[PDB]
Amino acid sequence: RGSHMEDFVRQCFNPMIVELAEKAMKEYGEDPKIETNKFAAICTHLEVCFMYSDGGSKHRFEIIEGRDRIMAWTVVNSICNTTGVEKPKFLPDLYDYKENRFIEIGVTRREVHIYYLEKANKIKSEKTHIHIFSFTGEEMATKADYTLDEESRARIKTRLFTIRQEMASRSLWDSFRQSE
Amino acid sequence: RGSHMEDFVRQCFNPMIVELAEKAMKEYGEDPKIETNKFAAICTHLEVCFMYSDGGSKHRFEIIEGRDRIMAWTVVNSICNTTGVEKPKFLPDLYDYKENRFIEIGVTRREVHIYYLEKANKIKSEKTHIHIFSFTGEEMATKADYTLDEESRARIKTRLFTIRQEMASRSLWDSFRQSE
Amino acid sequence: RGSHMEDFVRQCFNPMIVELAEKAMKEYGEDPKIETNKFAAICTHLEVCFMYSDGGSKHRFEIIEGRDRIMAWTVVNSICNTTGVEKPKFLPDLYDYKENRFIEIGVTRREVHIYYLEKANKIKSEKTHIHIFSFTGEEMATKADYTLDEESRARIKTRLFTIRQEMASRSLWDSFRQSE
Amino acid sequence: RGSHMEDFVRQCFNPMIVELAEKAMKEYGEDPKIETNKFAAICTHLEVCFMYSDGGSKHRFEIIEGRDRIMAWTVVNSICNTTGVEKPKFLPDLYDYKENRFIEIGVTRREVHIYYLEKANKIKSEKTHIHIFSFTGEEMATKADYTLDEESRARIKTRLFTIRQEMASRSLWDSFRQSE
Amino acid sequence: RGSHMEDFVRQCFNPMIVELAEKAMKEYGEDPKIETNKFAAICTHLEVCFMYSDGGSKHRFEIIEGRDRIMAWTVVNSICNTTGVEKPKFLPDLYDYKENRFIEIGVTRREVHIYYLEKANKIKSEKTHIHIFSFTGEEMATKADYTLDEESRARIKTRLFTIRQEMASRSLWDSFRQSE
Amino acid sequence: RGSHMEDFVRQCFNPMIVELAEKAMKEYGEDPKIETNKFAAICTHLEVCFMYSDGGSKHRFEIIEGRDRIMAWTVVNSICNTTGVEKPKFLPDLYDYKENRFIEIGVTRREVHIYYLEKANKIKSEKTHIHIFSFTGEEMATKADYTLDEESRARIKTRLFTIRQEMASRSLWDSFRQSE
Amino acid sequence: RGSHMEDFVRQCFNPMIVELAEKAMKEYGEDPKIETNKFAAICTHLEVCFMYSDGGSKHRFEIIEGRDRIMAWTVVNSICNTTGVEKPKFLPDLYDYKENRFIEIGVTRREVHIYYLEKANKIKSEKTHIHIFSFTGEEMATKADYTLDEESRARIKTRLFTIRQEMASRSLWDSFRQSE
Amino acid sequence: RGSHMEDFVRQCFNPMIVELAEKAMKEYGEDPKIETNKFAAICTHLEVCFMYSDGGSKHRFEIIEGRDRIMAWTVVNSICNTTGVEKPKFLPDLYDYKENRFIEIGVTRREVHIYYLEKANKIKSEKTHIHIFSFTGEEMATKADYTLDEESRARIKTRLFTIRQEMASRSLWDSFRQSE
Ligand SMILES: COc1cc(CCNC(=O)c2nc(-c3ccccc3C)[nH]c(=O)c2O)ccn1
Ligand SMILES: COc1cc(CCNC(=O)c2nc(-c3ccccc3C)[nH]c(=O)c2O)ccn1
Ligand SMILES: COc1cc(CCNC(=O)c2nc(-c3ccccc3C)[nH]c(=O)c2O)ccn1
Ligand SMILES: COc1cc(CCNC(=O)c2nc(-c3ccccc3C)[nH]c(=O)c2O)ccn1
Ligand SMILES: COc1cc(CCNC(=O)c2nc(-c3ccccc3C)[nH]c(=O)c2O)ccn1
Ligand SMILES: COc1cc(CCNC(=O)c2nc(-c3ccccc3C)[nH]c(=O)c2O)ccn1
Ligand SMILES: COc1cc(CCNC(=O)c2nc(-c3ccccc3C)[nH]c(=O)c2O)ccn1
Ligand SMILES: [Mn+2]
Ligand SMILES: [Mn+2]
Ligand SMILES: [Mn+2]
Ligand SMILES: [Mn+2]
Ligand SMILES: [Mn+2]
Ligand SMILES: [Mn+2]
Ligand SMILES: [Mn+2]
Ligand SMILES: [Mn+2]
Ligand SMILES: [Mn+2]
Ligand SMILES: [Mn+2]
Ligand SMILES: [Mn+2]
Ligand SMILES: [Mn+2]
Ligand SMILES: [Mn+2]
Ligand SMILES: [Mn+2]
Ligand SMILES: [Mn+2]
Ligand SMILES: [Mn+2]
């Protein structure tokens, strides 16, 4: 093809993030060269998940997102058959060994209130913790339990607003927002 | 030869783990290409020991397992002639500088209760701490003192159940369980 | 799934070869975990192509195989619009800057005579050079022009027979041969 | 040219520090080969900023100094539009996620009291924290809040006095002091 | 700013090429973020020079392009005061130790005949060899002496046409051609 | 020459430790090939100092030992002119930023009581803290303030007894002990 | 144990050479700590083989020595079933793709004439080329065909005499010579 | 001390060159901080020797310069007891396996004719080849046999004149020339 968004995504995100996002879309029958808005979203969600796991202790989180579907479900079964928690219907993003619960990370271009409403509607397993971030700097989690420290979450939202600025500077933000 | 277990072991474990396990069996007159079930067990026990030492403080543990028999006993003598603890009859796996005791790590495919019964029967030195893990997610230690934090131990059992799933997915689990 | 061939492929070939083969099959809607015979073939063809380009001078060959379909065709157009050769109907494997022709590399489990007959039947552009290798140690090229030196080609066939031996040692050769 | 200060700067500071300082001066139309005193000052200020961020927690500080003017302001806007603090008139050096304020780092060859008087006079945004260091071993911060621990600040001043000694040993300190 | 050409340049060329081009423009008071067409040209000319020096023997070429103006002239003086050749009026790109002459590399978007006419008009020192490349695949050198082997030059023009295709695929080729 | 001690020292200690010890002896007009007992002692003292600084916080210690005499004294002057402590008569080994004092590390083959008696007799500056270790597992520090945690010191003495065992295993311990 | 030869071997040879020699002896039920003379010989023979393969073209030699017995025989079968040469009775050291023959490398402490007499007596396959080196600087090969260039062989014998000097300098040469 | 020459030497030469030169002077009881002119000369002679060995084939030269006095003489004895050449009275710089002779490399600030006259007067062994270079671009060797190709020698003299220019640019050339 030849989109501005694709070149910006490769310039904005770490190369391993781009490769993992490409593998995730190709596993789900998606092309980064055509669905470039989803390409930027999957890269953003990937980085947010990794910065999230970077916060806290060393052995606190088990990273579910970023693995292939078979191995991700294998780790989920291992975590469930070990601690005793219920197997979630859909694949979560992380598992907290400190709080003993799965975490679903969300990144939205609209109000954080609407996304969780759809995220909580889909996620039937109420045990799975939900934590939403927005590109405007807002966040909200289940039971107001934000899991990480304030500084780690502040670093996440700062990065999100930086991605938003870089997108608007090259005039891809408008098409990126009205596409979720 | 040409066993499925040998190729799975090389694909499942870190290369340095495989090399250390090979050296340990060859030091005891064992061939990984024929005794592939023991090959997978020595790799599993090696990784569990290293994840165990990864938990806790930086200078907490001295790693006895993974060294050659002569150097491992040299470190054991050094630890004994320093702190003043009794020299164990058999080589332990770790030494805890925080609790001032040797640690014997066990990984079992049967009930954790039976192994320790044999492990405690062999280990005459009652000072040596014993900590057993199972592939089903169970654990138990001497005096109910589990040494590490809950998250580090939970990560160990999750990995053990993942190895069990990968083994059963390729139909090596049955021959691996009824072989201990 | 859980196939012996998949674990052998990951143990036999270089990791970057495995990743490039995975991307090539996923680009063509193929799963390495199910089509493990094709997984071993695409890895073998990939390595043969890279050893082939390793023979000769430094700037002799342009590597077409291993790139994504869009970039591979981009390099082919560049080579054609530069030297003046005709654009081949299908994607070749290499381009020889010394002989000024595209090269199609083939690896077969049957007689080398049959494959080229199908390869030359498909390849309408007679300018594209064809070079076939077999797992038994045979080779043959267009116009009896074998391009590389004898030692580089001998190293290629030696590797092919080593892959064949390792496959038969674990009893995957029979299913691999009667699958082409 | 051919100044002793330029060769000392390249020998005294880390290579990446020298490259970042060169880019900062060239961005502001300055030549390190002629303004060698400013070359040593920008390297010193750069290293002090990086040692400052090295103190404290992992996610505590966002490093503003060292980036290009456009990206530095992009991060500042991100931090402001996230936490809600006021946009400073001039570019600060760091942002504290723990104290929720921007930090302006200063390094002086005169009394620390005079510099801050000029630094606080320029910085209209009173929210921005100011922290001055001197080459004699003195320091002072806004509201007597020195942000970091005593050991991290002591390491900073020790390095500053070491740079001063190395400068005087080669007879560049006198021209470096009477040049601020 | 926010140009498509800038993100494509960072995605198309090697990172060290981009950094060297940035330093060359900033040394001459030029901004890559605004003069993005010149940004792509200086990166292209830089890579062509490095591929050119990559052809031939190990100690054949001395690379003049890519150094700062002071050090580049220092190497030119060294070469002149050693071999005895005349000092060129303007900075050349390479020096051939085999042919004992300086080389001026040119990359053009128009006919190679016009550029050399301007290049030979500017270069008063007739000893300096001139070698022009075009994005269409044409080349021509002084006295029809093309210095390198055919394969090394063919690789250069293939890369040039690949850059041209990638530019046209994202619709920057038209503005890049009508800008020389 | 050709001593067993020299080959054991190179096999027992880290290569950078050996190089730093060689530079220290050559700076004081000493040859490692002839004074091999001192070679083993300077390597042992070097490693103990580095393990000592490895204990505690990140910015706690400034490492004086291991630098050249001029730079070591330069750091000592920097520390003194910063904190305000008195300049010691002889070069110490470390500086504690937490306790604000210099540390003199000693390793002995005799009773720890005798060495400190000579160490405290030489060190006139009573502010400098003294910490002695022995190859038998004993330690003692000024004012019974052992600075580090018990685990870090236990790791130091364990290493010392391991060096003693390796020396006696090759029959260099007797000549090493009766040589201090 | 505690031998001077073992520490000298670890100090004299490259670490990977030492590891490969250890694996070769342990595969044949041999201990480097007790049979230290054989330890030095297997390291010497290993290095000579690798320097030998280092001479000549890039794809000239296939390295048989240094692999495990199963994989070494697998490569030998591949070479035989490819070129058509006869399978040797015992494992050779190299294969020459240029001369199409296996090479048996020998290193001796006695006269080169006696070793080959035993080497040629054992090696029934007359096709296998034999090339002997001595620690005194002598060499001789089958049919006076020395395979490599004079400089590569001269470098091999120079290294052999250097190992001999280092051995005699520490008084292990006498026990090493009267032990073959 | 604090000399301009010392900082220029560390900035001009590769770090390993500086370390090897420091070890050579300290082995001969010389201080780089005081004899900075000799410091620059030993670095220059070291680099010239390494560029000289870089010319030619892979196994052509054995590097004598840069080793410690004991190991350098050990290699010289090995070369003599192997090829059969006479042991030189003083340590040479290289050995040519192609021409079968030792090489003495010289770098001078005066006329190349005078140095060799002293070099040939000292070197009694007429077999040792002598090759002198100057900072003005002149060279001359024994029997007019310049050993290497013209391009490799031209690269050496170009580097020498570059070092001369950098020295004069900072006003150390005059004191460096009138000091030989
Ligand atoms: C939709 O196809 C996929 C599927 C996967 C595997 C699991 N996916 C997630 O877990 C996940 N997906 C999204 C997302 C992103 C873009 C468009 C729509 C959605 C719903 N957002 C999340 O927050 C999140 O956790 C990976 C990548 N793409
Ligand atoms: C049995 O030969 C060996 C010996 C060693 C050295 C010391 N071994 C242990 O310390 C150890 N061995 C086992 C184990 C594993 C497989 C079969 C039987 C046993 C008892 N399990 C442990 O938990 C454990 O600590 C290493 C490897 N193999
Ligand atoms: C078939 O889907 C693909 C397609 C590609 C891209 C281009 N492919 C080739 O160029 C190519 N393909 C084969 C091959 C391998 C397995 C089964 C059938 C065939 C015909 N053999 C070759 O020799 C060869 O050059 C890559 C991978 N898989
Ligand atoms: C003046 O041109 C520049 C500008 C920048 C970007 C932002 N600059 C700072 O933020 C900054 N500048 C100094 C400084 C240093 C030398 C002379 C005068 C001053 C005022 N001192 C600081 O403490 C400080 O934070 C970087 C480099 N040079
Ligand atoms: C014009 O400012 C500069 C100057 C330099 C230093 C030396 N420059 C060259 O040597 C050189 N410059 C060009 C070029 C590129 C874009 C626009 C105009 C020109 C004439 N083309 C070449 O072929 C070439 O050799 C580096 C970068 N920019
Ligand atoms: C003897 O046990 C082994 C066996 C192997 C595998 C194959 N061995 C050889 O190929 C080989 N062995 C020697 C050698 C060395 C010491 C003592 C006796 C001999 C005969 N010398 C060679 O030249 C040579 O090629 C490796 C190591 N040790
Ligand atoms: C003089 O002390 C040393 C000795 C060595 C070991 C062997 N030295 C040489 O081989 C050598 N020495 C010089 C040189 C350099 C400066 C002043 C005087 C001389 C004669 N010039 C050479 O060309 C040369 O080959 C290394 C370093 N310094
Ligand atoms: Mn997810
Ligand atoms: Mn999610
Ligand atoms: Mn054990
Ligand atoms: Mn155990
Ligand atoms: Mn193909
Ligand atoms: Mn093909
Ligand atoms: Mn600033
Ligand atoms: Mn500042
Ligand atoms: Mn130019
Ligand atoms: Mn040019
Ligand atoms: Mn000391
Ligand atoms: Mn001390
Ligand atoms: Mn052999
Ligand atoms: Mn042999
Ligand atoms: Mn010399
Ligand atoms: Mn010389």
Q: Please state, in angstroms and as integers, the Cα–Cα distance from residue A56 to each residue in A97, A107, A153, B133, D7, following that order.
A: 11, 20, 11, 26, 44
User: Which entry of A26, A89, A119, A143 is annotated as an active-site residue?
Assistant: A119
Q: CA-CA distance, B171 to G23, in Å (whole number)?
A: 32
CA proximity to F74, closest of A55, D165, C113? D165
* Ligand 3 atom, smallest distance to C93 CA: 25
Q: CA-CA distance, E77 to D108, in Å (whole number)?
A: 41
Cβ-Cβ contacts under 8 Å for E176 (sequence gap 6 or more): E5, E37, E40, E41, E109, E167
Give the Cβ contact number of residue E92 at 10 Å: 22
Per CB-CB distance under 8 Å, the chain A contacts of D77 are 161, 165
Chains in touch with E (3+ beta-carbon pairs under 8 Å) read: A, C, D, H
H33 close contact with F: CB closer than 8 A: yes
Q: CA-CA distance, F72 to F49, in Å (whole number)?
A: 14
Secondary structure element (H or E) that encloses residue E112, with its range: helix E112-122
Q: Return the active site residues of G.
A: 119
B178 close contact with A: CB closer than 8 A: no
Output the CA angle A45-A49-A54, nearest 5 degrees: 145
Whether residue C150 and residue G97 make contact (CB cut-off 8 A), yes or no, is: yes
Choosing from C22, C42, C73, C114 the residue with most ligand 3 atoms within 8 A of its CB, the one to mutate for a pocket test is: C42
| Length of chain G measured in residues | 180
| Neighbour-count burial for C154-178, b at 16+ CB within 10 Å, e otherwise | bbbbbbbbbbbbbbeebebbeebee
H157 close contact with E: CB closer than 8 A: yes
Please write down the long-range contacts of C19-25, taking CB distance under 8 Å and 24 or more positions apart. C20/C46, C20/C66, C21/C46, C23/A26, C23/C68, C24/C66
Cβ-Cβ contacts under 8 Å for F159 (sequence gap 6 or more): B78, F47, F48, F51
Joined together, the tokens standing for residue G58 give: 């890039």
User: Which residue ranges of F are tagged as binding site for Mn(2+)?
Assistant: 45, 65, 93, 104-105
**Which of helix, strand or coil describes residue B99?**
coil
CA proximity to A164, closest of A133, A131, A139, A136? A136
Pick from H26, H33, H70: CB nearest F26: H26
**B146 Cα–ligand 10 center, Å:** 18
Per CB-CB distance under 8 Å, the chain A contacts of D59 are 54-55, 149, 151-152, 155
Residue of D nearest to H1 (CA): D169
**Which of helix, strand or coil describes residue F94?**
strand
Q: CA-CA distance, A42 to A50, in Å (whole number)?
A: 12
**Which of helix, strand or coil describes residue G176?**
helix
**Which of helix, strand or coil describes residue C157?**
helix
CA distance G15 to chain F (A): 11
Number of H helices, E strands in chain A: 7, 5
Query: Which residues partner with D133 through β-bridges?
Result: D107, D139
CA proximity to H65, closest of H80, H75, H55, H79? H75
Which residue's C-alpha comes closest to atom 22 of ligand 5? E106
**Which of helix, strand or coil describes residue D108?**
strand
Residues B162/B94, Cβ–Cβ less than 8 Å:
no
Residue of C nearest to A32 (CA): C27
CA proximity to A47, closest of A72, A71, A80, A24? A24
* Ligand 1 atom, smallest distance to A92 CA: 10
Residue of D nearest to A138 (CA): D82
CA distance A55 to chain E (A): 30
Residues with CB under 6 A from ligand 4: D 24-25, 28, 38, 41-42, 45, 65, 91, 93, 105-106
Whether residue B27 and residue G26 make contact (CB cut-off 8 A), yes or no, is: yes
A79 close contact with B: CB closer than 8 A: yes
Q: Where are the beta strands (DSSP E) in chain C?
A: 61-63, 94-96, 101-108, 129-134, 139-141
Q: Please state, in angstroms and as integers, the Cα–Cα distance from residue E55 to each residue in A15, E153, G71, following that order.
A: 30, 8, 39
Chains in touch with D (3+ beta-carbon pairs under 8 Å) read: A, E, F, H
Query: Which residues partner with F62 through β-bridges?
Result: F95
Instruction: Write the secondary structure of E15-49 as one string of H (helix), E (strand) and C (coil).
Output: HHHHHHHHHHHHHCCCCCCCCHHHHHHHHHHHHHH
Residues A138/A113, Cβ–Cβ less than 8 Å:
no
H154 close contact with E: CB closer than 8 A: yes
User: Which entry of H26, H119, H124, H143 is annotated as an active-site residue?
Assistant: H119
Which residue in the block uniquely carries the two structure tokens 């710089």?
H93
D175 close contact with A: CB closer than 8 A: no
Q: Does residue C38's CB lie within 6 angstroms of at least one atom of ligand 3?
A: yes
Joined together, the tokens standing for residue C119 give: 């390869």
Joined together, the tokens standing for residue A93 give: 């993003």
Residue of A nearest to C2 (CA): A70
Residues D51/D159, Cβ–Cβ less than 8 Å:
yes
Per CB-CB distance under 8 Å, the chain A contacts of B162 are 74-75, 78
Q: CA-CA distance, C98 to E178, in Å (whole number)?
A: 35
Q: CA-CA distance, B59 to F150, in Å (whole number)?
A: 10
User: Which residue ranges of E are tagged as binding site?
Assistant: 45, 65, 93, 104-105
Q: CA-CA distance, D32 to D39, in Å (whole number)?
A: 5
Residue of G nearest to F173 (CA): G2
Tell which B residues from 121 to 150 touch A, by Cβ distance under 8 Å.
136-137, 149-150
Is A119 designated active site? Answer: yes
Q: Return the active site residues of C.
A: 119
A31 close contact with C: CB closer than 8 A: no
CA proximity to F132, closest of B75, F164, F118, B80? F118
**B104 Cα–ligand 11 center, Å:** 5
Q: Which experimental method was this entry solved with?
A: X-ray
Q: CA-CA distance, C169 to G74, in Å (whole number)?
A: 10
Tell me which residues have their CB within 5 A of the ion that is ligand 18. Answer: F 65, 93
Choosing from G28, G52, G73 the residue with most ligand 6 atoms within 8 A of its CB, the one to mutate for a pocket test is: G28
Q: CA-CA distance, G5 to F170, in Å (whole number)?
A: 11
**Which of helix, strand or coil describes residue E131?**
strand
F160 close contact with D: CB closer than 8 A: no
Instruction: Give the CA-trace dihedral at D76, D78, D81, D85, to 10 degrees.
Output: -30
